[PDB]
């Protein structure tokens, strides 16, 4: 339901003839990012499923072809919807830090053969956003320092 939405949006944006007919529909991307805003109050039931959708979108649609439009642009846009789900979910839900942050790190550290640039982007965003909110969930970082020797060099620099 997310990949179909991005295919539809790419098809309309590439052609004016379809822009004249079809009146501007909300897409599943904007609806999901509304769910993450809505869930702040009491909806903790929702947010453990937001985290699983985030990492299913990133895990399934991340790059591999560099280690084209149709294999690239509705898969680039889903994988960057994933990171947006997890970064907006990380900011407001003060209890699924250490469930995103130990799972981002667990994909950066252990995979290291498949391309993982998207997780380093997400980890950069998560850190850079607030290291003030990461000093309450910091030991998940310093347990991946002990695995730094065995990584390839570019992953260590990154």
């Amino acid at each position: 339901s997310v990949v179909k939405s991005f295919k539809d949006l790419q098809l309309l944006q590439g052609s004016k003839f379809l822009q004249n007919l079809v009146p501007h529909r909300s897409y599943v991307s904007t609806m999901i990012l509304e769910v993450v805003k809505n869930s702040v109050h009491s909806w903790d039931h929702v947010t453990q499923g937001l985290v699983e959708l985030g990492f299913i979108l990133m895990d399934s649609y991340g790059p591999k072809k560099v280690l084209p439009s149709l294999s690239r642009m509705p898969n680039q846009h889903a994988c960057k919807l994933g990171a947006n789900i997890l970064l907006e979910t990380f900011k407001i839900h003060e209890m699924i830090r250490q469930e995103i942050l130990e799972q981002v790190l667990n994909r950066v550290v252990t995979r290291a053969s498949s391309p993982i640039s998207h997780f380093l982007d997400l980890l950069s965003n998560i850190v850079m956003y607030a290291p003030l909110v990461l000093q309450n969930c910091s030991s998940k970082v310093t347990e991946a320092f002990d695995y730094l020797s065995f990584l390839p060099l570019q992953t260590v620099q990154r």
Binding site: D8, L11, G14, S15, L21, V22
Partner: protein
Amino acid sequence: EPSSPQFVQMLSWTSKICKENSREDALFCKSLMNLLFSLHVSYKSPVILLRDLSQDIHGHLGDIDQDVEVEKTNHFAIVNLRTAAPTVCLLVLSQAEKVLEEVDWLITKLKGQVPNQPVEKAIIMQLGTLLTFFHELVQTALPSGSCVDTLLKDLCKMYTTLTALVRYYLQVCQSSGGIPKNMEKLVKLSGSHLTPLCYSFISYVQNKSTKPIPNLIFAIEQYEKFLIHLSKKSKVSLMQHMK
């Protein structure tokens, strides 16, 4: 920005270069036509430009029956015997494939829908203009490279879109009751103009001496079968328009 006057200035300049300068070198014509199309399709539907370019291809290449004297060189100057035969045909058929994908998306959303009337009016307008476009190309003699099988595949896509359209008409005809008149002219044009010359083109490609031609004949017979069911369940005889 695609609504700016500088967009229209760039589109007019590109079109003027396309209307004057010949330049017999395939890569230059291909990249310049791609620039023109890329500008055009973000402004308005390209079907007029596709129609004129098919007329140029028909005028340069000729006909299958070798007794049709047609020359329409006035339209677009970047059309040559060494340019329009290998390279321009693939580009105009690829853009036509894109327009067929767009109307397929519209047809599928119109099936799922049951905002109603102008949508289907624009759909049958694009299909009519593309029908005249395809009518101009089916009579021509293309080289036996990728061009002929690309024409068969895109004609299969054309007939598939027509089949899906009359399928939506089969879905909708019970609630309202009746066929709009523009659809009647469209099915007259598809029966009279396209399909006999499609048969003649199959004979033309077959006589000169394996998968696309069975696909195409299956597509056209499924079109005729769904048209039988529509002409029964619509209280109108659309086979007197057909041959």
